[PDB]
């Protein structure tokens, strides 16, 4: 009846509240965190020790069933010990729901590779390597997939400048391409614009 | 021959109470004495205190005065001016 | 207007032009030098001054919402005419 | 100070996975030279192959040592199966770009690096 | 003890009686709405953008005015909170001008963000605007009066802040206009600062029209050096220029306020540069060259003199690593003739005791002080920010201030014993009444200005000046830890100079005049090539062509003060350093590496490669110059003023005049603001 | 608040032109979050994680 | 199974970073200053961390500032001050520290405005 | 009509400007007008996008109707404020008449 | 344009022009802006 306004589902928030705690009561020894969002999706987070447990509990579980990996994914969080979170995006085709699972790690610590669980991991684990430097063990084949061959570094990390370190170009004199330290003919131009004034009052942290 | 002598100390640590006991006692005689000499007293805070003699052609030497006396602080600075 | 350096260089409507002893014109040799001859500044003072019976006037550049945002203008001194911050466009109070 | 390692328990284990690794890139530096028909030497090979394993000689944990490890064997696999071009292979060798100084007054000179 | 119970959307906060409504919301971290309410203005009220609901109240309060009662709720989101800023945003957007794409204020605008964050999305006002005439306030500060939301700031700023009573309110109702009513400028020395304050594209800076957007801005946080006191500024650039300058907030030292010379100045760094080396070609006219072709004759030059024939002047902007790497660089060949333009009584202890030469209660502690003593100084145009505190005090606390000297404008009313020196004997010896003050007062506090001394019997005046402080502290009635004397500096780079232990003044040059002269940064004329020998070699490191420049046989290019990271000592002792916001232009390189690069030419090379390095040479010569913003106590007062006594010294007849009497001698007085083509209008402003 | 005025409110109304004028340099804000929003793509699954 | 490693965090030869830039360069750990144009304080609230300034010069084509600075751009956000502390160490940065600057606390009273008999009343409203 | 440039250098084109393809720098006239002095667009960074003309509060910078202009050369495709005024000049009366269609739509 | 002729502007061209690109006449593109740092002229007669 508010036209610009989102609609409220609170029978999926329900239902998705009671299946988190249900993964809680089976999975205590692994299971840190579980939250329903506003707009009605499900995050548990657990234990790096329990991507295995955890991921094969959600597959072949009789009311878990999520049989697919939609996505698997890092995020760097610099200001966070574990930098790195990575990010499960499960989809249960039988019941038609999805479920995010969530742990972390940091620039030395290995997570366990899940393509025992999904096959479909093997590259998106190849990607998190590749463009965050987080480890896999046990990967079948884990290799840079998305940078230059030889390229130094891991560009999603935050700390990683946008334009990288090094440029190429074709050089006469050596008849190949090159790589070179990087120059730019117009910077790019950091741009301020957060406001001064909170917008948001129900996310304020205490001060 | 000598051309400056720096004294660093802390206004409040123990390890600085010899040096300041001889600025307040024999600075205002030895400078007296020693009217074109520069004695700069440098006060910092949390600092171990030293003496710092500064000789011809920017030769610099440093003794250290932790836990010095006001007497051994006498004695360090005779040294320095002989 | 399009002045011409000493040089024979074109000045532009920012007052630009490489001076002597630059280099950098050498970048117009056997081509040329990209000047719009219609000065803002010299079509401006070309409009007329607009005369009004009453102390605010409001602009909003002409065409409706293909102009600009609507502004009122303040008329009250005489020394000087309202100017509009956005076209340039001049008024005057009658008497 | 208690975490997980990723290949190596301490730091004489991990000086093994060194010392392998280095033999696998120096009976390497042959067939590179011969496959990728490169105008440097064996010796220039090895003795770039040596410089890069003397930039990190000073790690002291055996995780550290153990990713360089891991990445300095997917760079070799790269070479082997010639998934590198000659290019790439060449970039170690900065053929194209000019000596920075390392002096002060070089330095000064130039710019205001520094 | 005190405190009261408060809740702030049903939190429990413990505050302060006294304490407001919107006050105790910050102590939650929530920020009320504002417009005319500002902390360090006196309450106004009027904008009405702070109301707030009080729980089971029906009235909504203005949280700015309100003190808070024991046991309130504050809503400060609820449904009657939030349509109360809805209904005063729209009043205020009403007869706004639709203004923002030529206004200087757009995307840092408080009226844009809280519209956006608390106000409604569209407009229902289906009437003509208000448009309201432009005033005339001087070069500095444009108006575009129909943007004024009729908040008051900058009228309790003129009168609070300013001590100003130009700016008012004329008319009434809607038609109610803020300005002078007559035509006349306002033009004081803190007047740039109505310009932040104000939230709306009103006052605006005429020398920043138009050039930059804030979003596009980077924000370097630096020091500025055209006084010493030290204020902290962001210099604004924009693609390697500089754009403008903002004060920014230190509590202890210049609050959020900057001068007009601070603010405004920078435009002289666009001019007048030095950005090649330049030496003397064949007929006496200096002519480009390289950096190692001028450093090579220098280098010549240098090792072929020792002792007193190789001397130094440092300029009023020069930095600590400038400062003790020509310090070392004349040390070895054995010269000692480190001389500063800006004279100290080198008498008794002279620079051998820091308290000797600082502002030992610090520009905070004028707050605590009861009766002030001003002596031989205009602080209004010495130091702005430093009389702005007193005036602060003067009106928070009922501070009573003295003044010997000229009679000058200080924006307050102080008490004038006379401008004769001889006064401050009548004082020490009692004879004088204002002597029953100082003895009642409980925080006493001296202020000799650096300025008087530079008189020929600047050793009389400290002597007598240090005196009087004197017997305050031993005749008891005062803390122990109050710091009764007090020497306020005008000079950026004096402080540091004289921890680093150069001799302040160029008289020791007078007296041994050199065959080789180093001018780093000096610009002040006190030496000229009529006090040297013929022949003698001048070199002049600097960032402006100016008055030294014009005299030397080599030049070479230095940075300005925003284009080094170097520590500058403020008139406390307290040590800040800048920060690079652009590269020096051109040729020109950071000063204390050119002494080191000529020092390697020279066959003397100095121990320190980086930064880092000559920071770690000058803790230690003087261990405080590496604490930055803390201000390191100096004791040994009655140790000073024992040395001061010994050699008896007479005072001159002449009554104390300070270099500055009226505005117009404010605006220029270095390089950087004499290049200005800014202050070049102030000037004329204010003259004409 | 999310979506720019009408080019004629944005020339008439004040509200307008600010709103205008900061969606189009800041924009708008976002609460905090995260979700994962797929479709079906001509493809098949075309997803966003969105944080 | 867990091994005891006694080292301090060190991961500069992992990063992928050139030499020169992890040990030339200058991190400054601060809070950014309030933008005194406005009275917001919400962009006073996260440590910032961000290197030292580099040169810009003009483009010969266009007058564009360029820049061989691949760090001209790179901040970084952080909840406390020891947290990009621990970021700056484990990376190899020299940084220096600055403490946070907070507003102090004002004693505001309305009705000072109208004294009997101090300064503070005013002459105008 | 009067022959005034359009735009008033509120640089709301460059900040919204997806590719950062726009550059602008400016100050007042000789008269009191807030003026341009640099108006740079880069054809080689522009995706061609829209919002800026979408951004502009008094229709100053807009795409144009031509898509003919490739070049021999990469600088030509460079377009300092000559360029781009010559170009309004040179296509305002079917530039005018697109925006005549089109603009109840926006 | 027969039927419905355009909008006449005295600042419209009344020649067009086409693709110039690879002729004398091309467009060459430079900075538009004046020189932003004024450096320091030394004094034209000798005095030292
Ligand atoms: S003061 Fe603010 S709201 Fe008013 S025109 Fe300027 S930017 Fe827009
Ligand atoms: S000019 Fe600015 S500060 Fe002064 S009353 Fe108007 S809006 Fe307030
Ligand atoms: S059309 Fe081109 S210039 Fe305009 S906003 Fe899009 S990318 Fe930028
Ligand atoms: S073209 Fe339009 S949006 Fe861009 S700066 Fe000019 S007026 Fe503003
Ligand atoms: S901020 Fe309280 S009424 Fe203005
Ligand atoms: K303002
Ligand atoms: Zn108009």
Redesign the interface.
């Known amino acids: 009846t508010r036209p610009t306004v989102r609609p409220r589902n609170d029978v999926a928030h329900k239902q998705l509240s009671a299946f988190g705690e249900y993964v809680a009561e089976i999975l205590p020894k692994y299971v840190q965190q579980v939250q329903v969002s506003c707009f009605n999706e499900l995050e548990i987070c657990i234990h790096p020790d329990g991507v295995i447990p955890v991921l094969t509990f959600l597959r072949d579980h009789s009311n878990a069933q999520f049989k697919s990996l939609a996505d698997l994914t890092a995020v760097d969080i610099p200001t966070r010990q574990n930098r790195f979170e990575i990010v499960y995006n499960l989809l249960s085709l039988r019941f038609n729901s999805r479920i995010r699972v969530k742990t972390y790690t940091d620039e030395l610590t290995p997570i366990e590779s899940s393509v025992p669980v999904y096959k479909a991991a093997n590259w998106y684990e190849r990607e998190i390597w590749d463009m965050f430097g987080v480890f896999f063990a046990n990967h079948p084949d884990l290799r840079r997939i998305l940078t230059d061959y030889g390229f130094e570094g891991h560009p999603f990390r935050k700390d990683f400048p946008l334009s990288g370190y090094v440029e190429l170009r074709y050089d006469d004199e050596v008849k190949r391409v090159v790589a070179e330290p990087v120059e730019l003919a117009q910077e790019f131009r950091k741009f301020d614009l957060n406001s001064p004034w909170e917008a948001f009052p129900a996310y304020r942290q205490p001060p | 021959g000598l051309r400056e002598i720096r004294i660093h100390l802390c206004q409040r640590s123990p390890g600085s109470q010899g040096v300041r006991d001889f600025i307040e006692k024999r600075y205002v005689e030895l400078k007296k004495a020693n009217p074109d000499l520069p004695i700069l007293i440098r006060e910092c805070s949390d600092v171990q205190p030293k003496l710092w003699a500064r000789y011809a052609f920017g030769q610099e030497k440093n003794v250290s005065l932790n836990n010095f006396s006001a007497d051994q602080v006498t004695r360090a600075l005779e040294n320095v001016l002989s | 207007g399009v002045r011409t350096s000493p040089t024979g260089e074109k000045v532009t409507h920012t007052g630009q032009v490489y001076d002597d002893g630059d280099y950098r014109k050498v970048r117009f040799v056997g081509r040329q030098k990209e000047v719009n001859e219609n000065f803002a500044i010299d079509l401006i003072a070309e409009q007329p001054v607009s005369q009004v019976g009453s102390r605010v006037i409001s602009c909003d550049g002409g065409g409706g919402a293909l102009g600009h945002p609507r502004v009122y203008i303040n008329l009250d001194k005489e020394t000087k005419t309202g100017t509009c911050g956005y076209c340039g466009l001049q008024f005057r109070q009658q008497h | 100070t208690s975490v997980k390692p990723i290949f190596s328990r301490d730091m004489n284990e991990a000086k093994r996975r060194v010392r392998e690794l280095y033999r696998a890139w120096y009976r390497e530096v042959p067939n590179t030279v011969h496959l990728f028909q490169l105008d440097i030497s064996v010796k220039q090979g090895r003795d770039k192959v040596r410089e890069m394993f003397k930039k990190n000689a000073h790690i002291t944990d055996p995780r550290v040592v153990d990713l360089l490890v891991i990445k300095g064997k997917m760079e070799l696999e790269e070479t082997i199966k010639v998934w590198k071009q000659r290019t790439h292979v060449m970039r170690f060798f900065h053929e194209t770009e000019a000596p920075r100084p390392k002096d002060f007054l070089s330095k000064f000179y130039v710019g205001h690096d520094p | 003890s005190n405190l009261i119970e408060v809740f702030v959307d049903g939190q429990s906060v413990m505050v302060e009686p ?1 304490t ?1 409504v919107l ?1 105790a919301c910050e ?5 009320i ?2 417009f005319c309410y ?3 203005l ?5 904008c009405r953008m702070c109301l707030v609901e009080i729980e089971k109240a029906p009235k909504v309060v203005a949280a ?2 309100m003190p808070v009662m024991k046991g309130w709720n504050i809503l ?2 609820s449904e009657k909170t939030k349509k109360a800023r809805e209904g005063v945003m729209e009043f205020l ?2 007869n ?7 206004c200087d ?13 608390f ?5 229902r ?1 289906l009437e ?6 432009d005033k005339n306030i001087g070069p500095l500060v444009k108006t575009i009066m ?1 943007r004024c939301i009729q908040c ?1 700031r900058c ?2 700023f003129a ?2 802040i300013a001590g100003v ?1 130009d700016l ?2 004329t008319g009434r109702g809607n038609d109610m206009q803020v300005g002078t009513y007559i035509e006349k400028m306002f033009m004081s020395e803190l007047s740039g600062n109505i310009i ?1 304050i104000c ?1 709306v594209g009103a006052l605006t800076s005429k020398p920043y ?3 930059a ?9 630096s020091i500025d050096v055209m006084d010493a006191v030290g204020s ?1 500024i ?1 210099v604004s650039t924009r ?3 500089v754009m403008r300058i ?6 202890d030292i210049n609050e ?1 306020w900057i001068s007009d010379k601070t603010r405004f100045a920078y435009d002289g760094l ?7 080396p ?1 030496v ?1 070609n064949e ?5 480009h060259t390289t ?2 072709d001028a450093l090579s004759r220098v280098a010549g030059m240098l090792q072929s003199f020792q002792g007193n024939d190789v001397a130094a002047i440092a300029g009023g902007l020069v930095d600590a690593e400038a400062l003790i790497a020509l310090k ?1 660089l004349l ?4 010269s ?1 003739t480190l001389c500063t333009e800006e004279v100290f009584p080198t008498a008794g ?6 308290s000797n030469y600082l502002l030992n209660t610090t520009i905070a502690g004028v707050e605590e002080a009861d009766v002030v003593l001003l002596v031989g100084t205009n602080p209004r145009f010495e130091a702005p920010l430093f009389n702005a505190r007193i005036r602060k005090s ?3 606390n ?1 501070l009573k201030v003295a003044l010997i000297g000229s009679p000058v404008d200080l924006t307050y009313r102080y008490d004038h014993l006379g401008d004769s020196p001889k006064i401050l004997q009548d004082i020490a010896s009692g004879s004088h009444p204002f002597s029953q003050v100082l003895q009642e007062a409980k925080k006493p506090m001296v202020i000799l200005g650096s300025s008087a001394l530079q008189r020929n019997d600047g050793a009389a005046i400290l002597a007598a000046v240090s005196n009087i402080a004197q017997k305050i502290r031993t005749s008891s009635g005062v803390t122990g830890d109050w710091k009764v004397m007090n020497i306020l500096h005008r000079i950026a780079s004096q402080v540091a100079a004289l ?1 680093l ?1 150069y001799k302040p003044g160029v008289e020791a040059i007078q007296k041994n005049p050199p065959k080789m002269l180093f001018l780093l940064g000096a610009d002040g004329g006190c030496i000229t ?1 009529q006090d040297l020998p013929k022949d003698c070699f ?1 070199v002049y490191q600097g960032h ?2 100016d008055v030294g ?5 080599v030049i070479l290019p230095g940075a300005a003060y925003t284009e080094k ?1 170097a520590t500058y000592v403020n008139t406390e002792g307290r040590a800040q350093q800048t ?8 040729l020109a ?2 000063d204390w ?1 050119i002494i ?2 000529l020092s ?2 020279a066959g003397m090379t100095l121990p320190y ?4 390095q000559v920071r770690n040479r000058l803790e ?5 110059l590496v ?1 930055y ?2 201000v ?5 007062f ?2 000073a003023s ?2 001061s006594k ?1 050699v008896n010294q007479q005072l001159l007849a002449d009554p104390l005049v300070p270099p500055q009497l009226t505005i117009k001698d404010f605006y220029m007085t270095d390089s950087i603001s004499r290049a200005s083509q800014t202050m070049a209008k102030c000037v004329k402003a204010v003259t004409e | 608040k999310v979506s720019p005025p009408k080019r004629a409110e944005m020339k008439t109304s004040m509200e307008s032109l600010i709103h205008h004028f900061k969606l189009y340099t800041e924009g708008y804000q976002v609460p905090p979050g995260a979700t994962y929003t797929a479709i079906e793509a001509p493809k098949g699954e075309f997803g966003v994680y969105l944080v | 199974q867990l091994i005891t490693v006694d080292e301090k965090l060190d991961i500069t030869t992992i990063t992928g970073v050139p030499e020169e830039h992890i040990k030339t360069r200058k991190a400054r750990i601060f809070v950014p200053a309030r933008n005194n144009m406005q009275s917001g304080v919400n962009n006073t609230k996260k440590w910032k961390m961000e290197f030292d300034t580099r040169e810009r010069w003009e483009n010969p084509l266009m007058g564009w500032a360029s820049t061989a600075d691949p760090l001209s751009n790179l901040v970084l956000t952080f909840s406390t001050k020891e947290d990009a502390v621990a970021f700056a160490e484990k990376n190899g940065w020299s940084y220096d520290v600055e403490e946070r600057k907070v507003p102090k606390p004002k004693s505001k009273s309305y009705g000072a405005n109208f004294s009997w008999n101090k300064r503070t009343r005013v002459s105008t409203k | 009509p009067s022959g005034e440039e359009r735009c008033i250098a509120c640089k709301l084109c460059e900040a919204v400007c997806p590719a950062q393809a726009i550059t602008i720098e400016a100050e007042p006239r000789a008269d009191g007008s807030r003026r341009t002095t640099r108006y740079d667009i880069d054809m080689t960074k522009c995706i061609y996008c829209g919002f800026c003309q979408e951004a502009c509060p008094v229709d100053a910078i807009v795409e144009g109707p031509n898509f003919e202009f490739s070049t021999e050369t990469h600088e030509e495709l460079l377009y300092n404020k000559e360029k781009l005024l010559n170009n309004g000049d040179k296509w305002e009366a079917e530039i005018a008449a697109n925006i005549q269609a089109d603009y109840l739509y926006r | 344009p027969t039927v419905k002729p355009p909008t006449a502007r005295k600042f419209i061209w009344t020649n067009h022009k086409f693709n110039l690109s690879g002729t004398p006449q091309q467009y060459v593109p430079y900075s538009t802006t004046r020189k932003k740092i004024q450096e320091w002229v030394p004094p034209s007669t000798p005095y030292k």
């Open positions: 006294g407001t006050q102590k939650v971290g929530m920020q709405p504002r500002h902390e360090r006196s309450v106004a009220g009027n700015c005015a400060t989101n957007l009403a706004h001008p639709l203004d923002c794409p030529i204020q757009g995307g840092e605008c408080d009226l844009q963000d809280q519209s956006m964050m106000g409604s999305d569209r407009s006002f003509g605007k208000r448009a309201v005439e129909t008051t009228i309790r009168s609070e009573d008012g309110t932040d939230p029209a138009f050039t957007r804030p979003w596009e801005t980077r924000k370097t946080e902290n962001v693609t390697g220029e903002l004060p920014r907030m230190h509590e959020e666009k001019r007048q540069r030095l950005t090649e330049m003397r007929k006496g006219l200096l002519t950096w190692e070392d040390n070895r060949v054995d000692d202890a002279g620079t051998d005791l820091r003067w009106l928070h009922d921890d232990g090539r001048i402006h062509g420049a014009p005299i030397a046989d990271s920060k690079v916001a652009v590269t020096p232009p051109g390189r950071e590496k080191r690069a390697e030419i490669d980086t930064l880092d230690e010569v003087s261990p405080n604490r913003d803390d390191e106590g100096a004791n040994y009655q140790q024992e040395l010994l």
